[PDB]
């Protein structure tokens, strides 16, 4: 019974670690996706300005 309690404690520790890392990954994931959205926006717009060079 004592060994079962120790193993259960360690398993619960690991599982809480799992959940916390998953939440951190979620936050990072959202930030990276928004970053790339605005990156592609600014890149397209620099290209549009270059198109302006073509129109000139």
């Amino acid at each position: 019974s004592d060994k079962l309690k120790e193993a259960e404690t360690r398993a619960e520790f690991a599982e809480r670690s799992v959940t916390k890392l998953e939440k951190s990954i979620d936050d990072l994931e959202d930030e990276l996706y928004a970053q790339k959205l605005k990156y592609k926006a600014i890149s397209e717009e620099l290209d549009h300005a270059l198109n302006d060079m073509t129109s000139i």
Binding site: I42, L46, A49, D52, I56
Partner: protein, 57 residues
């Protein structure tokens, strides 16, 4: 950037505007050489009339 778009627009359009005022001025200049041409034609015809006047006299 959108700001860049507007910048090139105002600058290029003012450039075309200035060139176009240049050519409208040049059109007025052309009409001015025209007026000068008719005035010189009238002056030469008047000189011919005066010389014929003196000869008739």
């Amino acid at each position: 950037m959108d700001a860049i778009k507007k910048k090139m627009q105002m600058l290029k359009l003012d450039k075309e505007n200035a060139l176009d005022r240049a050519e409208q001025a040049e059109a007025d200049k052309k009409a001015a050489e025209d007026r000068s041409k008719q005035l010189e034609d009238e002056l030469v015809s008047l000189q011919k009339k005066l010389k014929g006047t003196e000869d008739e006299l």
